[PDB]
Design a protein around this nucleic acid. Sequence first.
DNA 1: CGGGATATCCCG
DNA 2: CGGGATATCCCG
DNA 3: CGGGATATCCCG
DNA 4: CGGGATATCCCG
Lengths: 304, 300
Amino acid sequence: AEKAVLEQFGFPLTGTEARCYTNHALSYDQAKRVPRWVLEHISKSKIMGDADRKHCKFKPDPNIPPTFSAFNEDYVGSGWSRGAMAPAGNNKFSSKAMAETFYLSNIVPQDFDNNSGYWNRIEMYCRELTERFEDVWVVSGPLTLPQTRGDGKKIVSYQVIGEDNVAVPSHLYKVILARRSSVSTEPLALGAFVVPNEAIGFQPQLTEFQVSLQDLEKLSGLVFFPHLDRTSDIRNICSVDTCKLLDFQEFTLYLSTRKIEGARSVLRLEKIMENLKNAEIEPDDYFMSRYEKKLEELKAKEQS
Amino acid sequence: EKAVLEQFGFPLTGTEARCYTNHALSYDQAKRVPRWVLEHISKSKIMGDADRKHCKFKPDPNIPPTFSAFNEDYVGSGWSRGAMAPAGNNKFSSKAMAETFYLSNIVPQDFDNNSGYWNRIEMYCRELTERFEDVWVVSGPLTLPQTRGDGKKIVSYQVIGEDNVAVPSHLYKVILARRSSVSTEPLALGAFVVPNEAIGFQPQLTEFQVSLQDLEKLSGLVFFPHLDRTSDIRNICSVDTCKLLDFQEFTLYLSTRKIEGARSVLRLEKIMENLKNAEIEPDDYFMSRYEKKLEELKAK
DNA sequence: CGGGATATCCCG
DNA sequence: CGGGATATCCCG
DNA sequence: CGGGATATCCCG
DNA sequence: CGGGATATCCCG
Ligand SMILES: [Cl-]
Ligand SMILES: [Cl-]
Ligand SMILES: [Mg+2]
Ligand SMILES: [Mg+2]
Ligand SMILES: [Mg+2]
């Protein structure tokens, strides 16, 4: 009964409850204006479809109280990019699902090079795993880790941007859980990775950012996949699989191929080819056919 | 469809409210400190036999050890163990007081702040029970940003011990008081943000007062959600005083209490002299106890 | 009221 | 050996 | 695949 | 005036 008086006007609300969307769930951090964690499940069929990111717009999540919501004004001009945790490429199968990955509840301030480079390649590896595993679960989120000074003092220091003070993480994390098949008795494979929020080149391999699940849980203050039995056999994902990202040649050729569709003049399309030859990358048959037929499309445009 | 997503469960943040004998809290597993601590104070609870000296700081056995702080994190760190739910609010129950010494109720606090200005704030909260039947208090840590001279805004705080316990830059307290369950007077509310540093006696408590809205935006919390915000709610520093004990009053009480722990006529007489050097005149309550402890020490 | 340091001793 | 319990002292 | 910029419109 | 809305252009 003495509890009733204490609770009479309600406990303070933290707003950390799980929020569910078409193909991802997340816990929001109202103080930092960023997601705490974002859970997604990707399959072979989900990463295919006609949904297009160019038909999507970054906008605040209408389900978040605006007093705790980030806004594009916080990001634009800040020097940081809007970094999706649940990637759009994992939701080509549903335009509603993809549109929800552009809510700012799924966004953190992310280094421009990191977002479009190393982190983009990690996201691609997660999708490649659907060709070798039937089911793949991914948890992603931000981190603010301490730095040891010359005097031994350990300090957490991070920037906040915009009038709403959106927190800029020092690192990003990713936890990958893969089940080979729904009928196989093969053990589950798991990996936890912590990457610094900055430009990471092609030399460092993914394993160099791998950490134990326990250490990440201690760094984040989270417990991932609680229903999972840790006594059971759980193999290291980087031992069952390669944990191998696209190299410079493969990554550059794919981007060059995709950027053919966005070429707006013959000169711009020709510069893509020039880039490949400077990189000593030979185009494949898929690139050339798209290149020549896009060239013909733009040539006809320059006649009118 | 959501079943496959949650097949192995959602990640756990561990922010659910935890209830104890005379307070509740939400724990911050990443920072290893409480996020908020709610308590209800009344005149009956602040009286009793529960003794502070019979308690020990120790890990909260309800917290997973992976996310718990430990005394090894605090000792030698240059920071004191600061309770959010004060032990002084639980003289009525030895169990409730002991629970206020769980490290789940503790944050790294400046020594002077903990024993001084923040201590006086807690005393004022208890003082409100003389004029209000019910007093609710929410206390917790904050790590607030600082605007540099070049415009960039940065959050910077120290972490101590092998477990990296977050040292807050500021502490907050939200005070809600109801005159009585019978009365129809509006409720009194006040929100205060205090820097985790030595303060002194110059500043008045109102100098640290803030809008509830602003504190909620700084902390990311919503306090007292069942409180109707459109209703009539008064500034507690208008209805009441928000006046903390001044130097003379504070020092006299400390000098009075320190008699109990004097184990020599010398250190007992030093209390008197220290009080004299500060130009404070001792009251009868101080003298009466001065004699008994003086006589008691004559005997031995 | 709120917090400490230090010597001594125990024994797994 | 070394962490931990306990007096015993101390500060604002 | 992942992210930007700038111009110009509409109209409450 | 100011926030959406498109259109066009660009980067890795
Ligand atoms: Cl990169
Ligand atoms: Cl102080
Ligand atoms: Mg991204
Ligand atoms: Mg182009
Ligand atoms: Mg205290």
